[PDB]
Amino acid sequence: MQQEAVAPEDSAVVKLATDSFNEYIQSHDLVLAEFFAPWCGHCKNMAPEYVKAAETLVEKNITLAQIDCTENQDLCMEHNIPGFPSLKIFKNSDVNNSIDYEGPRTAEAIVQFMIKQSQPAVAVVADLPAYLANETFVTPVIVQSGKIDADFNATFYSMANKHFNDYDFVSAENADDDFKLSIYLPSAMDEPVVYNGKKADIADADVFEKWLQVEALPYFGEIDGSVFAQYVESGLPLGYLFYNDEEELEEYKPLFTELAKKNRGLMNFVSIDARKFGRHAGNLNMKEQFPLFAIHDMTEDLKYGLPQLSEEAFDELSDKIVLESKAIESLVKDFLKGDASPIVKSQEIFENQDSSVFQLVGKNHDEIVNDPKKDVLVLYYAPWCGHCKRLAPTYQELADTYANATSDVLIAKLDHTENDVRGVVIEGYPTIVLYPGGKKSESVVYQGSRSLDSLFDFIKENGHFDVDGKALYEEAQEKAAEE
Ligand SMILES: [Ba+2]
């Protein structure tokens, strides 16, 4: 048959239900539970890999279970299941400590993650250099060492537990040395980042958290879903190097590792695989032309990057693209100074056609919307949007009402899907803002039905020129009656 989400009932996988779950978790110390619905295609896509991991994992006295939520709603509510599939790890035979699996749903990724969960949250050692030399680490290593006080120790363990799948935690206690808290980063293992001893402070878990959010990031690692939130959680701008092959990345690693060490505290730098993630470039409003270097200020949502080819030039490009070191270096220091121009996404300005409705792009938006001789209505839209299309004939008859009788009003539309705009970012579409004047507040976002009269009255009531479009509409109608 075609592949189903439920595992074959004779496999290593264990079927768990409302009345059997608790007894099962609390007699088994490490359990991966899949909360699924049979109608779910991603649940079907992963079943073969789930079974293949469950097999590989019997060996280790670690269970993989399945709960079908369409039959176990009580259970799915109790575990707060948001969607399918949901993979939860129950540890220590306790149905109240679970964590989410968020990694690749492949057999190999699932067995690796589950074996890790059997390992202690803290490595308790005396010989620390042996420990650090023996393992090739892929994540930062958080080490407490020296004379460790009880209060800090509790915080440390609590963090080891909370951050179990983010960092490795080591306790190298030595009552003859001064306390240290250190981070070892994978590229610079012979050179820890040591906390700056407000020691009473660092046993506060918030102080501890904030320190980690910034300091416990590779200087120049690879970004992806598993780790993106960590870069966002630092609170700091993100530099992206898009690369299209590992040999090409290897050319940029030394410069970006230096730039990263230099500006650690100020921004981050990540490598990002163009083959896997080229798409993301438009998200940074860059062209998909790699390698590329861009900076995203996430807090401000401004985007910056190094100039690229026009799409014409690029399509006649017989050469590898190179980013010059100096241009990269230049943009970084400019960005961090405040000198550096964000990139604004825009369609080509329209040659424009016989509509009274002005079609704006991100390029020409401000000039026109700002102009003090106005009252400017802008409809922000997407063509992916029924309601915006619904409105079209109303928006057109509103534009015609004014075009006929006055120049004191501009009625305009911008496709937000294809054009950045600043200061006016309501989530959905349609969104409508009225710009009355360059010595007038904008704070006139429209709420209401998009009815013609609501819109006429809006412009009338909140417009600098008090243009009474209703009256004016009534006029046209009588004059059309040859009157
Ligand atoms: Ba002791």
Swiss-Prot record:
Site (described: Lowers pKa of C-terminal Cys of first active site): 105
Superkingdom of the source species: Eukaryota
Positions annotated with a glycan in the UniProt record: 61, 96, 134, 153, 404
PROSITE patterns: ER_TARGET (PS00014), THIOREDOXIN_1 (PS00194), THIOREDOXIN_2 (PS51352)
GO biological process: positive regulation of endoplasmic reticulum unfolded protein response; protein folding; response to endoplasmic reticulum stress
Disulfide bonds: 40-43, 385-388
One Gene Ontology term, aspect cellular component: mannosyl-oligosaccharide 1,2-alpha-mannosidase complex
Active site per UniProt: 40, 43, 385, 388
Catalytic activity field: Catalyzes the rearrangement of -S-S- bonds in proteins
InterPro entries from the UniProt entry: Prot_disulphide_isomerase (IPR005792), Thioredoxin-like_sf (IPR036249), Thioredoxin_CS (IPR017937), Thioredoxin_domain (IPR013766)
PTM info: The N-terminus is blocked.
GO MF annotation, one: protein-disulfide reductase activity
Domain Thioredoxin: 8-120, 335-464
Pfam families linked: Thioredoxin, Thioredoxin_6
Enzyme class: isomerase
EC number: 5.3.4.1
Site feature (Contributes to redox potential value) residues: 41-42, 386-387
UniProt site (Lowers pKa of C-terminal Cys of second active site): 450
Keywords assigned: Disulfide bond, Endoplasmic reticulum, Glycoprotein, Isomerase, Redox-active center, Repeat, Signal
Protein's cellular compartments: Endoplasmic reticulum lumen
Assembly and binders: Interacts with EPS1, KAR2 and MNL1.
Biological function: Protein disulfide isomerase of ER lumen required for formation of disulfide bonds in secretory and cell-surface proteins and which unscrambles non-native disulfide bonds. Forms a complex with MNL1 to process unfolded protein-bound Man8GlcNAc2 oligosaccharides to Man7GlcNAc2, promoting degradation in unfolded protein response.
NCBIfam families the UniProt entry points to: ER_PDI_fam
Family: Belongs to the protein disulfide isomerase family.
Protein name per its UniProtKB record: Protein disulfide-isomerase
Organism: Saccharomyces cerevisiae (strain ATCC 204508 / S288c) (Baker's yeast)
